[PDB]
Amino acid sequence: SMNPPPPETSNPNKPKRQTNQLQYLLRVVLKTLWKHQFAWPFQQPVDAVKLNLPDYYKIIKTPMDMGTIKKRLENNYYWNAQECIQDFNTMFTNCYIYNKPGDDIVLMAEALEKLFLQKINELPTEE
Ligand SMILES: CCc1cc2c(n1Cc1ccccc1)CCCC2=O
């Protein structure tokens, strides 16, 4: 079996910014979720080979994970906060699409998403 290439984390011709909202997404949102006891399954791309999930990338066509988001933030990949917020939401949604209600991994995603929502609620105004 085979994993796909990971999502892009580097693209020199993509225009970039470092904004206070993006700084918040790294220093508050990503850091909060990353240190959580349920973060570990989401800290890298889904390894469909190791996890024996041969249908994962048949079902999930827009993969995302916090390892990728971390790299994107640290390497200033984004133009705006909404891009990054979309990546987090893609990660959660993928989990809910692929798995079943009440599954351990879904409970984990739900706990992380609750924290995510609380932090994004207080996203600072620009400038
Ligand atoms: C069907 C198994 C599974 C599905 C998934 C993951 N696992 C492996 C896993 C499940 C529960 C707790 C930790 C890892 C981790 C990555 C994200 C995901 O949707």
UniProtKB/Swiss-Prot annotation:
Compartment(s) where it occurs, according to its Swiss-Prot or TrEMBL record: Nucleus; Chromosome
Domain Bromo intervals: 17-123
Expression sites (tissue/organ): Ubiquitously expressed.
Signal peptide: none
Positions bearing the site annotation: Acetylated histone binding: N99
Effect caused by changing D104G: Found in a patient with a neurodevelopmental syndrome; uncertain significance
Post-translational modification: Phosphorylation by CK2 disrupt the intramolecular binding between the bromo domain 2 and the NPS region and promotes binding between the NPS and the BID regions, leading to activate the protein and promote binding to acetylated histones. In absence of phosphorylation, BRD4 does not localize to p53/TP53 target gene promoters, phosphorylation promoting recruitment to p53/TP53 target promoters.
Remaining remarks: JQ1, a thieno-triazolo-1,4-diazepine derivative, and I-BET, a benzodiazepine derivative, have been tested on tumors with success. Treatment with GSK1210151A (I-BET151, a I-BET derivative) has strong effets on mixed lineage leukemia and promotes myeloid differentiation and leukemia stem-cell depletion.
Associated disease: Cornelia de Lange syndrome 6: A form of Cornelia de Lange syndrome, a clinically heterogeneous developmental disorder associated with malformations affecting multiple systems. It is characterized by facial dysmorphisms, abnormal hands and feet, growth delay, cognitive retardation, hirsutism, gastroesophageal dysfunction and cardiac, ophthalmologic and genitourinary anomalies. CDLS6 inheritance is autosomal dominant. A chromosomal aberration involving BRD4 is found in a rare, aggressive, and lethal carcinoma arising in midline organs of young people. Translocation t(15;19)(q14;p13) with NUTM1 which produces a BRD4-NUTM1 fusion protein.
Purpose: Chromatin reader protein that recognizes and binds acetylated histones and plays a key role in transmission of epigenetic memory across cell divisions and transcription regulation. Remains associated with acetylated chromatin throughout the entire cell cycle and provides epigenetic memory for postmitotic G1 gene transcription by preserving acetylated chromatin status and maintaining high-order chromatin structure. During interphase, plays a key role in regulating the transcription of signal-inducible genes by associating with the P-TEFb complex and recruiting it to promoters.
Family per similarity comment: Belongs to the BET family.
Listed name of the protein: Bromodomain-containing protein 4
